[PDB]
């Protein structure tokens, strides 16, 4: 169980850094423990394959150690591992803490930029990233609804959460409020059933029209009174006929039956449009 470590001592550090120094001393002999001055650290030109520990993941020294490929982890990682009696992680990427330690996420319907931001957070918290979905994926970060991946996840009945969940976990992490992803409520971050949809309706009685209107707003979607191109995503129609229908069909907009809208709210996620196509043929 012993492992070779190097602590980096600066002036600013630290609250946890010193909890770590001690925690390790009670765990193993100093033979495995080295303490490095920022000067000493900068001289290193080779990856010892040792374990380096830095409290601030931003700094001239950090950048150097990271560029080399060294294994860097935050003090909170050591404390976490010591207390849970589980081995420290191998740091292909620097791991600041273990809040997200046993979780493996996936992403869909996110701006490439947003995706990368989430990945950096998940990685720095002891989590992994799995683009393709299989048994091992535990959570799906979704920016919107509709993709195949989104549908496969909903079928496997896996938690479909917003990027805010990750941002929250991270932010509540720096600030000493939380130590585990389970400490907050996933429920409050569920991806709205119609998030991303812009729904229009036709041929429904005023009562029904007003119902889908407020149910849409209640589930993250946007309601539009009229069908405008480059603005409407779904047009709820019962049958393949009418001037409005033919126009939506012309714009390549989804024409679906009410069955789609209400089954979505029933099942708890946005249904596949192919199953509810207004047009049979």
UniProtKB/Swiss-Prot annotation:
Residues 95-183, 189-278 form the BRCT domain. Changing residue 244 to A: Abolished interaction with phosphorylated HTATSF1. Changing residue 149 to E: Impaired interaction with phosphorylated MDC1. Does not affect interaction with phosphorylated TP53BP1. It comes from the Eukaryota. Phosphorylated on serine and threonine residues in response to X-ray irradiation. Induction: Up-regulated during the S phase of the cell cycle. Up-regulated by E2F1 and interferon. Disulfide bonds: none annotated. Highly expressed in heart, brain, placenta, lung and kidney. It is found in: Nucleus; Chromosome; Cytoplasm, Cytoskeleton, Microtubule organizing center, Centrosome; Cytoplasm, Cytoskeleton, Spindle pole. Scaffold protein that acts as a key protein-protein adapter in DNA replication and DNA repair. Composed of multiple BRCT domains, which specifically recognize and bind phosphorylated proteins, bringing proteins together into functional combinations. Required for DNA replication initiation but not for the formation of pre-replicative complexes or the elongation stages. Necessary for the loading of replication factors onto chromatin, including GMNC, CDC45, DNA polymerases and components of the GINS complex. This is DNA topoisomerase 2-binding protein 1. It comes from Homo sapiens (Human).
């Amino acid at each position: 169980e012993p492992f070779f470590v190097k602590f980096l001592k600066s002036s600013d550090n630290s609250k946890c850094f010193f909890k770590a120094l001690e925690s390790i001393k009670e765990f193993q002999s100093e033979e495995y423990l080295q303490i490095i001055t920022e000067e000493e650290a900068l001289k290193i030109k080779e990856n010892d394959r040792s374990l380096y520990i830095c409290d601030p993941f931003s700094g001239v020294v950090f950048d150097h150690l990271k560029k080399l490929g060294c294994r860097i982890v935050g003090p909170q990682v050591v404390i976490f591992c010591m207390h849970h009696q589980r081995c420290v992680p191998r740091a292909e990427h620097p791991v600041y803490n273990m809040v997200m330690s046993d979780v493996t996420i996936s992403c869909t319907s996110l701006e490439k930029e947003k995706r990368e931001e989430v990945h950096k957070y998940v990685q720095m918290m002891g989590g992994r990233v799995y683009r393709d979905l299989n048994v091992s994926v535990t959570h799906l970060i979704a920016g919107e609804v509709g993709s195949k991946k989104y549908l496969v996840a909903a079928n496997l009945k896996k938690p479909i959460l917003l990027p805010s969940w990750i941002k929250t976990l991270w932010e509540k992490s720096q600030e000493k409020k939380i130590t585990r992803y389970t400490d907050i409520n996933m429920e409050d971050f569920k991806c709205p059933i119609f998030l991303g949809c812009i729904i229009c309706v036709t041929g429904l009685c005023g009562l029904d029209r007003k119902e889908v209107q407020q149910l849409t707003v209640k589930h993250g979607g946007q309601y539009m009174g009229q069908l405008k191109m480059n603005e409407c995503t779904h047009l709820i129609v019962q049958e393949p006929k009418g001037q409005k229908y033919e126009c939506a069909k012309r714009w390549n907009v989804h024409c679906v039956t009410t069955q789609w809208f209400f089954d979505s709210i029933e099942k708890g996620f946005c249904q596949d449009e192919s199953i509810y196509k207004t047009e049979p043929r």
